[PDB]
Amino acid sequence: ATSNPAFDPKNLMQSEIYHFAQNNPLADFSSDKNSILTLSDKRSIMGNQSLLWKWKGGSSFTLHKKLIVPTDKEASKAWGRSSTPVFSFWLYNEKPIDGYLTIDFGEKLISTSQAGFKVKLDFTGWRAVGVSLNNDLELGAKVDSIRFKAPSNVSQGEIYIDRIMFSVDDARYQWSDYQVKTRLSEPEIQFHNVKPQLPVTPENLAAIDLIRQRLINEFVGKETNLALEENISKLKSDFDALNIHTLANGGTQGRHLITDKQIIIYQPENLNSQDKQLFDNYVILGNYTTLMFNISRAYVLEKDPTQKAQLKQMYLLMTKHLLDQGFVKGSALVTTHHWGYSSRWWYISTLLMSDALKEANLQTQVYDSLLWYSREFKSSFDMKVSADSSDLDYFNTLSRQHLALLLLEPDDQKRINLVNTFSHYITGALTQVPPGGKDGLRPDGTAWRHEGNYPGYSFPAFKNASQLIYLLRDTPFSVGESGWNNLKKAMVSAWIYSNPEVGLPLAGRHPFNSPSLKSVAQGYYWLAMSAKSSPDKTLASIYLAISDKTQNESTAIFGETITPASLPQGFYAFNGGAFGIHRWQDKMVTLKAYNTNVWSSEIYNKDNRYGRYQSHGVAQIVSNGSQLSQGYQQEGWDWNRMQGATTIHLPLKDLDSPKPHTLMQRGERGFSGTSSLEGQYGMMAFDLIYPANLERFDPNFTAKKSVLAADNHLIFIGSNINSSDKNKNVETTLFQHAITPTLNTLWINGQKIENMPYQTTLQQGDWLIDSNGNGYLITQAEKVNVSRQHQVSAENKNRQPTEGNFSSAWIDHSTRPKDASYEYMVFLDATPEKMGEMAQKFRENNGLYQVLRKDKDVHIILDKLSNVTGYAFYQPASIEDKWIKKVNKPAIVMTHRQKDTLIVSAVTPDLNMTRQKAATPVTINVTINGKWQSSEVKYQVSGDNTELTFTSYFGIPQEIKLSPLP
Numbered sequence: 001a002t003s004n005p006a007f008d009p010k011n012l013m014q015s016e017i018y019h020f021a022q023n024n025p026l027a028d029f030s031s032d033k034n035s036i037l038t039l040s041d042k043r044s045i046m047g048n049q050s051l052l053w054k055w056k057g058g059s060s061f062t063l064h065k066k067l068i069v070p071t072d073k074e075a076s077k078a079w080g081r082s083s084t085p086v087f088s089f090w091l092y093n094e095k096p097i098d099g100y101l102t103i104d105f106g107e108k109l110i111s112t113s114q115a116g117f118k119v120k121l122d123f124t125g126w127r128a129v130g131v132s133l134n135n136d137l138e139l140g141a142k143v144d145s146i147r148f149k150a151p152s153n154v155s156q157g158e159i160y161i162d163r164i165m166f167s168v169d170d171a172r173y174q175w176s177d178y179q180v181k182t183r184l185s186e187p188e189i190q191f192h193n194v195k196p197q198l199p200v201t202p203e204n205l206a207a208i209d210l211i212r213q214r215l216i217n218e219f220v221g222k223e224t225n226l227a228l229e230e231n232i233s234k235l236k237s238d239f240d241a242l243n244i245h246t247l248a249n250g251g252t253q254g255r256h257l258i259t260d261k262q263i264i265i266y267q268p269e270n271l272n273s274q275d276k277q278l279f280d281n282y283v284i285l286g287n288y289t290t291l292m293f294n295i296s297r298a299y300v301l302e303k304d305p306t307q308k309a310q311l312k313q314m315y316l317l318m319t320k321h322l323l324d325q326g327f328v329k330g331s332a333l334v335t336t337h338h339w340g341y342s343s344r345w346w347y348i349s350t351l352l353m354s355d356a357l358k359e360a361n362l363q364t365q366v367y368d369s370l371l372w373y374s375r376e377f378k379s380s381f382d383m384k385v386s387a388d389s390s391d392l393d394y395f396n397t398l399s400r401q402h403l404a405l406l407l408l409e410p411d412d413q414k415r416i417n418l419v420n421t422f423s424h425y426i427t428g429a430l431t432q433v434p435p436g437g438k439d440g441l442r443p444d445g446t447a448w449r450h451e452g453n454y455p456g457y458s459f460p461a462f463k464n465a466s467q468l469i470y471l472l473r474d475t476p477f478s479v480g481e482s483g484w485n486n487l488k489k490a491m492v493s494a495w496i497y498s499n500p501e502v503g504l505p506l507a508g509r510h511p512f513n514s515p516s517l518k519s520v521a522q523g524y525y526w527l528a529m530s531a532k533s534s535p536d537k538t539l540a541s542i543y544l545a546i547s548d549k550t551q552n553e554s555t556a557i558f559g560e561t562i563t564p565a566s567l568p569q570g571f572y573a574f575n576g577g578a579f580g581i582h583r584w585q586d587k588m589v590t591l592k593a594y595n596t597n598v599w600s601s602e603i604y605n606k607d608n609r610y611g612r613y614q615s616h617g618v619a620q621i622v623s624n625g626s627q628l629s630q631g632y633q634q635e636g637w638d639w640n641r642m643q644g645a646t647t648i649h650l651p652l653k654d655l656d657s658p659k660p661h662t663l664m665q666r667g668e669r670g671f672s673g674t675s676s677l678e679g680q681y682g683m684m685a686f687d688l689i690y691p692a693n694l695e696r697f698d699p700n701f702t703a704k705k706s707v708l709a710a711d712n713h714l715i716f717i718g719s720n721i722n723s724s725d726k727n728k729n730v731e732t733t734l735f736q737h738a739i740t741p742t743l744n745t746l747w748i749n750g751q752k753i754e755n756m757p758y759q760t761t762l763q764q765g766d767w768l769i770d771s772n773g774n775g776y777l778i779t780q781a782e783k784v785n786v787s788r789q790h791q792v793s794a795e796n797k798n799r800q801p802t803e804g805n806f807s808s809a810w811i812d813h814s815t816r817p818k819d820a821s822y823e824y825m826v827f828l829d830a831t832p833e834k835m836g837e838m839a840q841k842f843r844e845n846n847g848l849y850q851v852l853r854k855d856k857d858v859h860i861i862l863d864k865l866s867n868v869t870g871y872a873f874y875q876p877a878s879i880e881d882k883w884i885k886k887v888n889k890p891a892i893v894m895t896h897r898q899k900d901t902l903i904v905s906a907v908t909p910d911l912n913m914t915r916q917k918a919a920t921p922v923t924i925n926v927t928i929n930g931k932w933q934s935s936e937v938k939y940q941v942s943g944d945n946t947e948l949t950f951t952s953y954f955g956i957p958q959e960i961k962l963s964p965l966p
């Protein structure tokens with residue numbers, strides 16, 4: 001407390017706090033005849049004393065303090081977010097009081113004299129009170145009196161008060177509770193309950209007790225975002241620092257507990273130096289509950305009976321202090337928003353300490369408390385399945401905490417009802433196809449958060465959802481097979497699109513820090529061992545491969561010999577992210593487009609700032625292993641030159657997202673993505689269309705970009721390339737990788753190039769091999785630039801300068817001012833000898849491939865090495881072709897004539913939905929030349945031709961094997 005008024009316009013954000021650790025601490029206070037005010041060091045919140053107020057019913061005391069109460073608009077301008085001036089204090093009751101305390105605000109008040117509010121006194125322990133002075137009183141500039149009036153209908157009593165504070169707070173976070181009513185309320189959980197009920201039986205109770213033990217086993221025998229401490233010396237040292245002591249007739253003294261979000265009410269950055277020093281003695285709840293967990297884990301593992309007893313006493317004392325500090329049912333503590341960050345390991349600690357809380361008679365208090373603060377999570381914790389139930393962050397941050405809370409329910413019948421309902425909730429969450437862009441799994445195996453396929457969020461959700469299924473396995477509470485099947489699809493998909501990191505195109509807003517399947521490994525064991533017919537040999541074989549374990553090691557893990565999965569081979573279409581994956585030997589190629597339903601990039605205030613081209617028809621090649629070790633190095637990376645993309649080469653100031661905060665740029669039509677044939681061949685169709693009027697986006701930048709992938713090779717073609725400036729700085733990147741001692745060699749036309757710097761220009765019939773063994777044969781280009789150069793770039797978070805040496809090659813489209821084009825072929829197993837053979841084959845009337853059409857309506861590529869034809873119908877069309885006559889929608893078609901059969905696949909990569917609507921299936925009529933007979937594809941001979949009817953659901957290709965009719 002200073003001599004200045006609260007909310008001093010001159011220093012609006014500086015809190016005024018009565019903590020009584022200063023000179024003449026009751027200077028500003030006076031009492032009527034019927035009240036006595038003492039300082040007590042028996043308990044306190046801030047500094048070592050609190051106000052002891054003894055009273056008869058109806059007696060007041062007055063705090064004399066000038067308040068220049070700002071409007072909400074003034075407070076919000078001073079801070080820069082929606083704000084309100086708040087009055088807050090802490091009070092302690094040693095016994096409950098059947099009545100209300102009245103707090104009145106006015107000018108020159110005494111016991112017998114504007115606005116005010118009431119605090120119900122029927123409780124024990126510390127409670128916090130926090131009200132908006134503008135919004136929560138039942139305030140003219142001249143307020144100088146705050147009058148605390150003891151209840152009129154209670155003959156005597158006594159209350160401890162501390163830390164009376166005037167502050168500017170976030171306008172969202174003064175919550176109602178059992179003591180104070182505010183304009184804001186977080187309603188309590190109302191648990192859903194599924195019928196029929198499971199009975200309390202010895203079998204059902206044992207299954208419950210087994211689930212709890214299985215959770216204990218997972219937390220005592222390595223979690224992300226858990227600060228594990230197994231050293232008892234360290235645990236007792238951190239505990240002793242808390243200075244917790246049991247008090248005489250009940251409660252505790254010890255350092256004050258506050259959450260990371262609660263501190264906002266202080267505006268700590270603006271505290272005067274006296275106040276800050278006291279505030280710095282607080283303990284952050286996250287750290288305290290982490291200590292409770294590490295102690296509970298040490299207790300469970302501890303062999304020495306004396307140490308084991310000490311760990312238990314430490315855990316129960318920390319529990320009693322936590323409850324006495326007002327973390328109990330009905331105590332909002334003004335707010336507990338983002339409760340999970342502060343409490344997640346408290347929930348888990350109760351599993352380990354469940355018998356110890358039972359014996360100490362704390363289970364019901366701790367359950368009531370955790371249930372109350374969980375009300376923040378009522379949308380999930382109520383356990384009614386809804387469109388939002390497939391939340392991927394929930395699976396990561398909250399699902400095991402939720403199960404722990406249910407297991408802490410003291411009644412047996414209720415506990416069984418809650419866990420039965422939980423099993424139903426998790427089954428629905430893992431089974432349902434959420435509408436539109438909502439979080440969750442999808443039928444092609446993609447997994448969505450922030451309204452798109454997002455491995456950075458899905459990978460942690462896979463790990464914990466697999467663990468949940470495994471914890472409930474082989475009990476009456478086991479997750480339904482439909483949820484197991486869907487999660488299997490998503491996790492086998494993740495194995496296909498990672499190597500073992502997801503590519504740059506799947507990195508979301510963290511390019512060059514891709515999630516790795518290595519972090520999800522244990523999930524494959526947990527899902528493999530929770531199969532109806534366990535172990536699932538596919539998931540078990542993937543666990544062994546991703547965790548680098550041998551066939552020899554398999555019997556002990558799975559109870560039978562399982563060969564570690566070899567890397568997946570062939571082509572897989574994932575239109576949930578308008579991508580596909582081509583795999584050959586140890587290489588993965590991520591082919592990525594974008595469209596109305598697939599954002600190109602997530603760009604935030606400090607994330608992925610130069611990410612505009614992340615999905616621009618990219619084709620990133622990755623060998624099994626570290627992408628950094630293959631030269632995907634952020635430092636000096638030219639953000640314009642994403643492998644395979646057609647881009648405008650911009651200065652980074654113009655490539656930077658035009659929005660200062662968030663942009664998730666969606667495309668201009670539904671159609672763009674991939675398709676597959678026989679699980680082996682693929683095609684990408686990318687319609688590059690820019691917005692009519694977005695700053696820094698050339699509205700006339702266009703391209704049609706197709707790729708056909710088969711076996712060791714990919715054929716890349718482009719047409720209809722344009723910009724506002726005759727294709728000036730328009731480029732297609734063949735490759736870009738750092739130069740290192742392991743990545744030092746390029747081959748050009750049989751010559752090894754190692755010099756740095758180096759520039760040259762190549763044309764049709766030339767070839768290159770990058771340092772990762774990818775060959776590029778130029779089959780149509782006027783001008784391919786190759787560069788080994790020092791590059792200056794900037795890092796994607798804070799735009800700070802970076803530099804590095806890179807090998808790259810790109811096509812310069814400026815030589816063709818209108819409707820520029822390209823063709824080139826990649827060999828994934830290139831050697832100088834093999835590239836010499838491919839170049840000679842290309843020179844023999846192109847024995848490699850044939851483009852049968854390349855225009856704005858259709859791209860048709862015949863691969864003569866694989867004998868496969870890909871058809872990208874950018875528009876519906878009739879064509880001239882041996883196989884395909886007509887396609888009535890934008891679609892990707894693929895054919896393979898083998899001996900006695902024609903195999904035809906078809907799909908539209910268009911998901912046929914919005915951010916709100918469920919995807920519905922698209923009917924595609926594909927007419928083929930000639931008479932055929934035979935898959936859910938329908939066929940009908942119609943004159944000399946055959947009509948195929950495909951159903952394209954969520955961009956999932958269908959195919960049919962046809963044989964000729966006489």
Ligand SMILES: CC(=O)N[C@@H]1[C@@H](O[C@@H]2OC(C(=O)O)=C[C@H](O)[C@H]2O)[C@@H](O)[C@@H](COS(=O)(=O)O)O[C@H]1O
Pocket residue numbers: 393439449450451604662
């Ligand atoms: C606040 C912000 O920039 N973006 C919002 C998202 O917040 C980010 O994502 C998450 C997260 O758990 O997903 C936590 C952090 O606040 C921040 O990194 C998020 O609030 C989304 C909504 O998610 S979605 O319903 O899945 O779309 O909205 C973003 O703009």
Ligand SMILES: CC(=O)N[C@@H]1[C@@H](O[C@@H]2OC(C(=O)O)=C[C@H](O)[C@H]2O)[C@@H](O)[C@@H](COS(=O)(=O)O)O[C@H]1O
Pocket residue numbers: 224225396397456457460508510513514515
């Ligand atoms: C896509 C995304 O930001 N996802 C969030 C995580 O961020 C990724 O992973 C990590 C990391 O070390 O975990 C760091 C980078 O921010 C990014 O590659 C991460 O912030 C977690 C935090 O989880 S929480 O504390 O465990 O609940 O949330 C991710 O899913």
Ligand SMILES: [Mg+2]
Pocket residue numbers: 018019020021044045046047048049050162163
């Ligand atoms: Mg104090």
